[model samples]
Target: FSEEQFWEACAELQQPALAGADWQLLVETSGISIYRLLDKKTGLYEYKVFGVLEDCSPTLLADIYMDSDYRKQWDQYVKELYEQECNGETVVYWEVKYPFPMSNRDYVYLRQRRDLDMEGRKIHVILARSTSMPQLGERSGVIRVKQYKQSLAIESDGKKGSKVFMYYFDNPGGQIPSWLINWAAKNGVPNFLKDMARACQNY
Candidate 1:
């Protein structure tokens, strides 16, 4: 998508529908409230993560999230992550670590970054989705994330801090029991967020 198209979609992801017939809160802690939106007919759940970090700048935070080289230093679950192709847009490779009994998942993501509204509340947006690359096929003993969408919206507090809003969903592609899903939903992202905050301190 063009940069114009990217921002247009991000405008929708921002101030998104808080809760509805399909969305419900699953975990709330450390000023972060995580919600799960269910597509009952398909038995799938989409997640929304809302929270704040008082000492991190929006630009710095967005920079950390977008810098693939920098990410390797902070992201614990990244088994492997790197950037590929730079004709105009960035395409990335990511492999996530999943616990035993659950196959690891890898993704080819097209990422976009933008500074939305400079005068008004400065917001930085990073959006990515799974895409295909023939050279990088699914690895042995790993599940390819065929469908995944994730976005991050960071608004500068205007005083050296930021308010972060994140939304994510991916079909891991396989039979994953509810108990396991709920377990990850409750403990996974929040822990990542905490680590994310910690990482910001060093940058």
Candidate 2:
């Protein structure tokens, strides 16, 4: 998608008033608030997360998210993660570890980032969506996530911190326990943010 469209989509998620009735608050704690809305057509939940990173800037937070190399050092679920330039766009290959007895999951996706100035306000946006590459065919014993998308919008919070908003949706193909899914929806987002904060401090 074009950068303009991507930015617009991200902006839409940031403004809950546009369609505030559809979003349901999932959880709020540690300065983070998460909301979810069900997509009836796909029967999958789309998540919107809001938070502020204290003592951080928009550029710093964006850098931390886009730095896949540094991610390996802090993210425990990463099995293999790398990026390649394909037809002028960056394509990322990520292999994620799953709990025992469950096959690992992999994603082939395209990601784009933009730094914008909104009338003196600095903003950083990162958008990613699943895609396929014929040259990099599927591997055995791994589940390929064919449906996934994420959008993140980070704006300067006036201080050293950043105001963050994110949207995530993914269909982890194959059978997964209901309880596990619930836990991830409820706890995963917050846990990841906490790890990211620590990572930023180390950076």
Candidate 3:
């Protein structure tokens, strides 16, 4: 059931560009625009991020994001990340760090990637979702994140620049307060993209 819903959401995102009404812009800064909306189907508040990076290519963005080895250096919230694939499908385990009062979260997900050619632009898309694989089990200190899906699409502008689109929906199960959510919506996201831009500069 969850897998089917994930596929549906991914399909929807893959279809066309977003309509302004579909998502409300929460904040815009550092050439990044963050938007949010309550997904009608999943009944979860989702976030959409759009931005441009100068002097960066789609392949560079993909290379940085997909490289598990380099992820720890840049991503401050990652506790642990490792790759595990079954057959030809890609799966990964992630442990995300939260504050002391809040328990950390862990996830196991299947990730898929594809390249696209749209009007001579090289665009790359990656989709990932929470999965209940038999082999991957939960840990004691970490709460499991469920029903999560995030998609990233990057397109090269043929001018050493790239445009990024990100969509994320997740139910971070457990009792989390509204204050933290508000903080993340305001400061957390803006800083996230700022760090990403800095990463590209250092690359």
Best by TM-score: 2
Candidate with the larger lDDT of 1 and 2: 2
TM-score of each: 0.87, 0.89, 0.82
The 10-residue segment of model 3 with minimum total lDDT is: 1-10
lDDT tens digits, residues 77-167, model 3? 8899989777777788889888888889998888876666555655677888788876777778799887788888777655777777788
Per-residue accuracy of model 1 over 50-86 as CA lDDT, tens digit each = 7667778788888887877878867888899899785
Ranking by lDDT: 2, 1, 3
| Candidate 3 Cα RMSD (Å) | 4.0
Residue 44 error, candidate 3, Å: 2.9
Scanning candidate 1 in windows of ten residues, the lowest lDDT window is 5-14
On a 0 to 1 TM-score scale, where does candidate 1 land against the true structure? Answer: 0.87
- Model 2 CA deviation exceeding 4 Å by range: 18-21, 185-187
Q: For each candidate, C-alpha RMSD in Å?
A: 2.3, 2.0, 4.0
Measured on C-alpha atoms, candidate 2 has an lDDT of 0.82
Model 1 residue 63 lDDT? 86
lDDT of 2 at 162: 85
Model 2 over residues 1-203: C-alpha lDDT tens digits? 68575567557535654265588876775576778887778777778888777867678888988899999778988999999999999999999988878999999999998887767766888889999998999989999999999988888877878888888889988756777766766777568777878888889
